[PDB]
Amino acid sequence: PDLYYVPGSAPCRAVLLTAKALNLNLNLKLVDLHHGEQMKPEYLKLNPQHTVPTLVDDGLAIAESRAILTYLVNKYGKGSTLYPEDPKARAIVDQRLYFDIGTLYQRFGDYFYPQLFGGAPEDKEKLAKVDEALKFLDTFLEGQKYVAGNNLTVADLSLVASVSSFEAANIDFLKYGNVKRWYETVKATAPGYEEANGKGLEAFKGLVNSIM
Amino acid sequence: PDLYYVPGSAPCRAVLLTAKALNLNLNLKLVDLHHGEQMKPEYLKLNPQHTVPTLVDDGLAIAESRAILTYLVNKYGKGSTLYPEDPKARAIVDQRLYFDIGTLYQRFGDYFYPQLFGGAPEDKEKLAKVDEALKFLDTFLEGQKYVAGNNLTVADLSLVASVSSFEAANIDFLKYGNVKRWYETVKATAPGYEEANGKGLEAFKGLVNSIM
């Protein structure tokens, strides 16, 4: 299967983490954003939203990283605890994934991208919404090893890609004690973490340091 | 199972449509937002984010409507075409659900809620982002009966509740021809549409008419 990606994107690093945990090789296709490759007609046939990641696997094109994560386990994840089939346990993983896109990463993007791209000053109300989402995540982790149970799931891999990006914005997330414990646990237990997430996070940091 | 809900909420109407399509009884529990019931300690025990909907099913509390939608089919609608088990077909449904929360409904809220709740004038750049998401949805429907194939899925029920809300904002979405064909098809073929979605949509319309 092909993965159209860029390394600084946290949704793309979530896919790379999931493929490593599945011991699944993807043919990586770096997308040339500096020439607008994602809005040429052949990419738009695969992905009309012209976003990354896009997984292409035997003719089927999947946008939305969190749909890619669950597809990879549903299709290639025999013997995996990463996305359990029990409806109650799957619902907890699914709930954390919707929390990731709809609340935690959404508030991070609304807070940071006006500073990075718009040059705007730091909105303390938008920082407060980030801190509130981190407190929700801290509450989810209260008494649990991972965000959806005692096993590493795709919700952890999606959320650690989102939360690692907060480092480039110098957001204090380690002051949340359950978040800090969980963050170090995922870094130590997600297979191939430094290659799949840590390397692409440095490219995001190099972009941020070159501007701010 | 219990469903904590409010009728104006599009995520809650998506759950109500899914329960009707599954021919499922839920014990509906109306949440008193006019006295802030969602911030009592007992509700925050179920749902720390103090949002609606919250499904409570035999000890498990599930927030995030789109995680509730798939849970209901995974638990009470095994083998139903509303959420097919084939990984390719499930991935198309999951992709449309993440498009719903992350792009279409997110941009609708970013456009409309500053006018409704903040009193701000109409931002036509934010309207342009809503129209682009509707063009994406129009492109997804270009060549299929429904948003993830030729059968009604939970992605159609989630998206019709989101797109229903556009009527209260008087957003022109019917000018997208595939969206218009799909919208009228879902209204005619989703079981109990007027009871599950149309009735609660009138409470949202009544709020908007009283202000604007």
Side-chain angles (χ1 to χ4, degrees):
Chain A
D2 300 334
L3 183 72
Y4 295 88
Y5 86 112
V6 294
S9 151
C12 290
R13 296 183 262 120
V15 179
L16 298 170
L17 282 165
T18 298
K20 288 284 202 197
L22 287 164
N23 199 9
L24 185 66
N25 174 81
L26 308 171
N27 302 126
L28 296 195
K29 313 294 180 185
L30 183 67
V31 173
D32 193 359
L33 302 179
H34 279 80
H35 294 65
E37 182 202 334
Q38 77 276 29
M39 262 152 273
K40 270 127 117 177
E42 280 277 71
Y43 196 87
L44 295 163
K45 193 221 203 73
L46 309 171
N47 190 350
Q49 294 171 83
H50 58 76
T51 57
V52 284
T54 309
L55 184 83
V56 186
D57 182 27
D58 284 321
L60 160 85
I62 314 176
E64 308 286 347
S65 63
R66 296 160 188 92
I68 292 161
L69 309 195
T70 60
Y71 168 78
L72 288 180
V73 191
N74 291 335
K75 186 71 174 171
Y76 300 116
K78 185 175 299 196
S80 207
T81 38
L82 290 169
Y83 196 47
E85 289 136 52
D86 173 72
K88 181 232 76 147
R90 184 159 294 201
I92 302 173
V93 181
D94 283 332
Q95 192 192 143
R96 301 295 188 248
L97 292 168
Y98 282 103
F99 166 81
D100 182 37
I101 185 171
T103 304
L104 178 123
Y105 200 66
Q106 183 64 231
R107 284 156 181 218
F108 164 75
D110 292 331
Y111 163 72
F112 187 47
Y113 298 149
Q115 308 183 62
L116 186 60
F117 296 102
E122 186 207 42
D123 196 312
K124 316 269 192 115
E125 220 298 286
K126 293 176 168 156
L127 178 58
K129 289 216 159 210
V130 170
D131 281 317
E132 193 197 18
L134 285 171
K135 184 63 206 107
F136 295 146
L137 176 55
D138 199 75
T139 299
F140 299 153
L141 291 157
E142 170 63 49
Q144 325 268 309
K145 198 172 176 207
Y146 295 99
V147 298
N150 202 242
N151 305 313
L152 177 83
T153 63
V154 290
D156 300 281
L157 305 184
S158 195
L159 278 156
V160 80
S162 306
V163 166
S164 65
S165 310
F166 288 31
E167 286 183 5
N170 297 333
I171 292 165
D172 191 3
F173 61 97
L174 292 177
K175 72 181 183 198
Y176 296 93
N178 295 327
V179 176
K180 171 189 186 162
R181 186 205 84 236
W182 159 86
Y183 190 59
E184 288 154 6
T185 299
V186 176
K187 291 204 283 173
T189 61
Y193 174 82
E194 279 305 314
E195 188 189 345
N197 188 63
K199 272 215 302 177
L201 178 66
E202 265 294 312
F204 183 41
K205 282 185 180 178
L207 180 70
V208 165
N209 301 334
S210 80
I211 293 152
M212 320 192 48
Chain B
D2 305 317
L3 181 70
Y4 296 87
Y5 92 107
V6 152
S9 169
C12 288
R13 296 181 260 118
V15 181
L16 296 173
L17 286 159
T18 306
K20 286 280 192 194
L22 284 167
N23 197 236
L24 200 65
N25 210 34
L26 305 174
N27 166 42
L28 296 189
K29 308 202 65 194
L30 179 60
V31 169
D32 185 9
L33 307 174
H34 277 85
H35 299 77
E37 173 197 347
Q38 77 273 24
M39 320 272 196
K40 303 156 62 81
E42 273 289 90
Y43 194 84
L44 289 151
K45 174 167 219 113
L46 308 174
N47 188 357
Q49 297 175 80
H50 53 81
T51 56
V52 279
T54 306
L55 184 86
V56 182
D57 186 16
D58 277 102
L60 191 76
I62 323 181
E64 306 290 344
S65 66
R66 291 159 194 95
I68 294 158
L69 302 200
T70 61
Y71 168 74
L72 293 180
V73 184
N74 287 339
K75 172 87 169 166
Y76 299 111
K78 201 84 195 296
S80 148
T81 55
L82 295 159
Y83 196 50
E85 301 178 65
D86 167 65
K88 183 192 173 247
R90 185 160 288 208
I92 310 170
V93 178
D94 284 334
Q95 192 182 160
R96 298 306 178 241
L97 291 172
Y98 282 102
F99 163 80
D100 182 32
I101 184 173
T103 302
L104 183 95
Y105 202 63
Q106 180 69 49
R107 282 162 186 212
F108 161 73
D110 298 336
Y111 164 73
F112 190 47
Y113 297 153
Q115 305 178 56
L116 181 56
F117 290 102
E122 184 196 74
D123 196 318
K124 283 116 88 172
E125 221 283 292
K126 300 188 163 154
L127 177 60
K129 297 233 256 216
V130 167
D131 277 344
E132 194 197 20
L134 285 172
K135 184 61 178 114
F136 294 151
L137 175 54
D138 197 79
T139 301
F140 301 152
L141 295 154
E142 170 62 35
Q144 309 247 61
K145 196 175 180 199
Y146 294 98
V147 300
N150 284 338
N151 301 329
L152 184 82
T153 65
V154 292
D156 297 288
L157 306 181
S158 189
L159 278 164
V160 76
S162 293
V163 170
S164 300
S165 314
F166 287 39
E167 286 183 6
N170 295 297
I171 301 173
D172 188 1
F173 60 96
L174 291 176
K175 64 181 194 185
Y176 298 94
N178 293 317
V179 174
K180 169 193 176 150
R181 178 203 94 236
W182 158 86
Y183 187 73
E184 296 167 340
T185 297
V186 177
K187 292 204 291 179
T189 61
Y193 175 79
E194 287 297 320
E195 316 98 274
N197 188 69
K199 198 177 77 212
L201 169 67
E202 278 296 320
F204 185 39
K205 282 187 188 208
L207 176 70
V208 178
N209 295 337
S210 70
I211 288 130
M212 317 196 50

